[PDB]
Design a binder for this molecule. Structure first.
Ligand code: F6R
Ligand code: F6R
Ligand code: F6R
Ligand code: F6R
Ligand code: F6R
Ligand code: F6R
Ligand code: F6R
Ligand code: F6R
Lengths: 223, 223, 223, 223, 223, 223, 223, 223
């Protein structure tokens, strides 16, 4: 399972990349417009992320019509080979994904909330599909069940579109995504940061240090 | 999973094909009789659908006897390489299917209501079998259960006949068909249209637009 | 399980009540607006339904604010002892329900789409809660799953609010509701009519008649 | 579980009654008209069965209209206190059951093929409901699954109508009915006869006889 | 799943073969003895079936001893390359099967009533094994349970012997055999004919034809 | 299931109480310390919540030693009959709970992270036990699993301690708690407000209102 | 599944081999010592079984120490290429198995009572492992449970050691072993004989004979 | 499944190696420091274990920082081709693992307590991942459930990192690891010794000895 960072915050991205555990980044118009304030320009933020991140970087079109979507998609793709064009689940969006896939431009269908939307995105040829689990949780449905159905459907038809679990809010979305077999999860920075940690790791290391001091007062390992 | 449109309404067909999400069309004598009104001739309608749809188009024979069925079948096939001959689950119908399969004419056995009828059609060599889930719902049986059994039976024997779920009434027939692994669903146009939609997709788009306006008054993505 | 008719069509109501299989009626502002045409007044229609149905009749308030809701509720209640006030799942609606329950006015909380909304309505003291299964099917979730969860939750807490399955579209919603154990279903008239029917009932009757003619030409039972 | 004999053959009935294992009898127009030949009159057959059988005897009305059904039902009931009036699952039949139940005349709703038909019969007040399992088997559906759903539904609502499994064709319908918890099964004579038998019973008795002869050459037990 | 006819009635066999749905025939001494009356001789009956059926025809030996079984088997095989020799599950029978399998004579082990008998037959080299589901039903065990165990056992050891479900009494034996994945079912004629039929098929056909007459008075499809 | 608010923010508490859906409040030292700024004193905050909330209000001791815990508990209890003393799962805490329970002072054992800790708290006499589901989610364990085990354990021994699910982060913690049958959930304000909401509720309301204006221009319901 | 006979009785072995259903033989020191009485010598018994049985014959060492076990194993192996050396699950036994496996002497680890003992034997390279199901039944544990776990473990690691189910006491140990998929069962003679038999096989044969006499008073099949 | 010994006690290691059932050794700073007393030096202990054990020997770094961990890892690697470098699950540790893997130095990530930590270790390229089951048991969670989830995760993504179950306390951790399909278990010496043992093995050997003495007084097997 690939782990992407779901943010447009360049500091968070630099930190996660230096950790070595970030395989890519997803953004959306809200995430970018949050960072593009007090003089900072959205085009610069997007370019900087593309520069910093070695793996895929998803950037969402803002046009709602087919032609504008395809035009924006081509600009995005032209920014770097790792850019992936995020396109919403709409009629025009499916048309745009079909066209872009024929042009070998990588795409990510977003704002997916049920498994048949995900299947339609796959049938249009989309590289990644992003079902939103936390927004479904928000409205009182366990969003992970949609992931489980998508995985079954995609397995049934040997679908090559990658399942990218999005709207992730906690580490159990991540755990359940891995047990189901989702291809990718994209996670906010807070969540990402907690994935490496456990109190018994901290406690065990502390006791190892203490015990080692008994035979090596300076705490080193001389071999 | 392939998605066919279940209608003979030309406008519906044009529009769905235009959305790029329609992989073929099924008709039957009722759907067609519905369109062949006010001077419109059934032959013109059938030829037009063959013309504008790239994928399979199912057209049903009206004869009830073996010889009439094969004669009408050969005419339907002669109309275009994408024509599929729809033939009812009857004794004469199974014989017709065997003959037509020997002649490399594609066939779709219809009016199937249980799994052993579907198996018999497959044994005759039929290209598609069409169990009617909504009509089973109508008589107080969950029609999807028949689709699950047919999928198991066909898996057991590596049967190449495609399961084409028909008499679809709602998007949960579609969802359950995809989780089971049916090869095709055929859907009325209103159902087709509903499959792309979700209130959280609309709401998420609206919010992305509103947030983007904060940093781009013209609401465009200039890169 | 009680079976209500979901309509404001007087003829439908008369006929279903005449069949003796209808235990009450639910309306909403759309169903009524449909009937209040060509000089027919909504007030006359509501009063007439109250008059001819012996069981509960649900009538929805149109105000969106607490005070308007309780005023309209008290009027609806004042129309007959069988009137049940339908009130939407909103903040103002929950407050209205609590007040009205304190006043021993029967209530039905409507536009419920998940199990915790249903639990909140029950906690307000509502007499019936109405989850909308067909509208959930429309957005690609199996609505019956929500009914199962509500039945479990209400069993866990010995909740006395009746589960009234609404937005019913087919006889399998009805069948699954009865297997789950919902207290009530409300059904459109076409659905109601289909519930009595089965092709093997018709065929069995025909055969009994034909066999009886063999020993009684007049086809009667003379004892 | 009560075991009824499903026949109008008076010899079969006399035999099963003398076995001591027959708790009642069901008939239908086909079963009676089969026996009422070569001079034998249907009224005499019905009277003879009522005389012979101590338990319930179901006799079906032939009228299809409410008034005729109720008139015939009253004649049937007047033939003896153990008569039960069999009435088909139709609109008029439900009306007739309601009326008869209010008149304390025992009723049996027949030609039931799904669980919601059975529920409607129960709601009309019917004493027994008879789902037909073998006729469902005939059309490629496992009829026992309907019994299982009816039992769950009736348990959910503490329904007092007895489930009378009919159209029984083999001893496994009987076994499964007992494991499900159906109140009654009605069985053809062939089936009834096989229920007491097993080859290991025969073999065990034979070996007991043989072994006993060793210590009592005349085969008796003198105590 | 292959479907054989279980009968020695030439008219039934001709009829089913002409339907195109019969893949072979099984006979036994009782079945043949029923037809070999009023002058008809068993040898002619056997030869006539072998001539009419292109697929396997199973004919049972009558000897109970190894040498007689093997001699009769060689005669049976001498009647045609489609003859299959039916041999009972006995010590002599297993020896005969082993010898015949070495001689490349196809064999069918019959009178099997549990899964370990079926495994012993497979280990002797038998081509088909026939567990008798109806006769288990007769003694109060669900016979299909035995088919499911045999399927699992044969799958575990990659056994090439075909499971031929025999003593079939109804269409649910056939349905369950297909869902389990038995290789062959052999069915009496009454059962076979019922497999193609369903009331909704007839009803749907009738409605299509009625609708078609609206646009084509002669009921024709002219293309 | 009772629903408490997990906060010490007076405005949130006033708002939720005025909604009529809040059955009590839980606080902890972090929550209170967040509000006790810019002059506001913790004592006033505690007393103000006790005055506003008619239901239980849980207030945590700060002493880590038995004697201090018991003294603080008695002060807390002295503030009002609805005060519940929150005491951590520690050796001292269990001793304090046992003493306080004997004194008829209501108690809430907090900082519980597995089912055996919850059982120890129940055995000390505690009124409520609060397992922390979100903090388990944080370290990569599905916290709801622990609630399910505690429910089963408490049911086995007919334990009267209430399960109060704490550290709730989303509406699915609440849904799952209700399906499990936890006695109480305590939720932060953001979560609480989201529980009443669903997009289909808003959409349905809007459509009803639009339809009603068709028959009542002023949007009124005059009865 | 291979079926071995578990005995040292030469008459039983000769009978079973002559039946054609015995694939090999296991012995142990108790079984041999039982036969080696009244002047019969164990060396003679061992050699005679090796001579009679085509397949594997397991003969157990008596030494408890590594060097003696390996020496005795070499003597056993020298008796015939079908001899398999039975070695107990002990520390020295595992050493002996590893050595003998390196010398290409086939081995069978015996006295195994749980799945991890079986795993250790496999890791030593043993040809067969013999878990003892009946001695586990004797002490109130269902011994077939360990067969199931051993099958799963060996499947997980693609282990080549054959599972040889031993201490078999009845035909249901055999049935369950085949359904699990054990490689081999070794059975006492009484059990072996019972596997071919069933009362309905006997009954069925008798009836076929009787019916055949009708068309052939000879009892012959002339073809 | 590989079985390693979890100790730094040379006598235990020597004994287990000599038994031939030990596939490798894991150590940690606590285990080494326990043995490095009475003048014994950790460098010597480590070297002696590397010398005695043919299989993998895991030796833990003591630095907490990337640079020092990588330096120590290269020293450890330098000691012998069978050295595996044990590195804790920390940010620095994942960085070190990635570096060492790129240098083809075998690694074992330790102090893992949930499945997502294990997944992060696998994504860094680690050779072995060691989840600690007994320490999870110590805090009231069944640690084996974590192994089951890791096995499913690794199977989903075809992960080559071996699952090395650590912190093992009893033989049922071993049995459940084998049934799940973990690649390796590492076990303390007292657990390792109990794995070969069972009371029925001892009892069966004693009885075989006694029975054999009856036919060979010296207890020998002369062949
Ligand atoms: C290395 C990782 O495989 C091992 O030596 C572990 O540190 C121990 O297995 C941990 O066990 P304890 O919980 O008993 O320290
Ligand atoms: C052909 C078979 O795939 C289809 O056109 C079917 O006739 C319809 O899907 C049946 O649907 P209705 O039950 O709505 O006629
Ligand atoms: C009142 C609540 O029981 C009912 O009239 C509901 O409004 C309808 O059942 C909703 O059905 P639709 O989804 O068809 O409007
Ligand atoms: C792109 C799709 O993978 C992402 O940036 C999604 O928009 C977010 O993951 C959605 O998360 P929120 O529900 O928190 O906006
Ligand atoms: C009365 C209802 O209990 C019965 O006589 C039924 O009509 C028969 O049991 C139906 O059986 P068939 O399907 O064999 O007619
Ligand atoms: C041969 C074995 O496949 C068949 O002819 C069997 O004898 C029959 O299928 C047995 O059926 P009955 O139990 O109905 O005799
Ligand atoms: C008291 C126990 O019911 C509560 O106030 C708890 O402390 C909180 O629910 C803990 O939640 P956080 O993990 O969000 O602090
Ligand atoms: C050798 C190992 O396969 C066999 O001879 C076993 O010793 C016996 O199967 C053990 O059976 P008992 O428990 O009945 O002695």
């Amino acid at each position: 399972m690939k782990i992407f960072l779901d943010t447009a915050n360049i500091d968070e991205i630099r930190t996660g990349v230096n950790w070595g555990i970030v395989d890519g980044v997803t953004t959306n118009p809200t995430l970018i417009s949050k960072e593009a304030v007090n003089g900072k320009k959205y085009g610069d933020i997007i370019r900087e992320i593309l520069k910093i991140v070695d793996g895929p970087v998803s950037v969402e079109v803002v046009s709602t019509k087919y032609e504008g979507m395809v035009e924006e998609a081509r600009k995005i793709h032209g920014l770097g080979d790792n850019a992936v064009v995020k396109i919403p689940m709409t009629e025009d969006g499916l048309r745009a994904i079909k066209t872009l896939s024929s042009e070998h431009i990588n795409t990510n269908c977003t704002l997916v909330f049920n498994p048949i939307q995900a299947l339609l995105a796959a049938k249009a040829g989309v590289t990644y599909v992003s079902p939103f689990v936390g927004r479904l949780d928000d409205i009182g449905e366990d969003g992970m069940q949609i992931i489980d159905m998508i995985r079954t459907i995609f397995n049934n038809y040997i679908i090559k579109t990658q399942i990218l679990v999005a709207s992730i809010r906690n580490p159990i979305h991540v755990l359940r995504s891995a047990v189901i077999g989702a291809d990718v999860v994209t996670v906010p920075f807070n969540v990402l940061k907690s994935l490496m940690k456990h109190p018994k790791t901290d406690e065990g290391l502390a006791k190892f240090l203490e015990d080692w001091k008994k035979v090596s007062p300076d705490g080193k390992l001389i071999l």
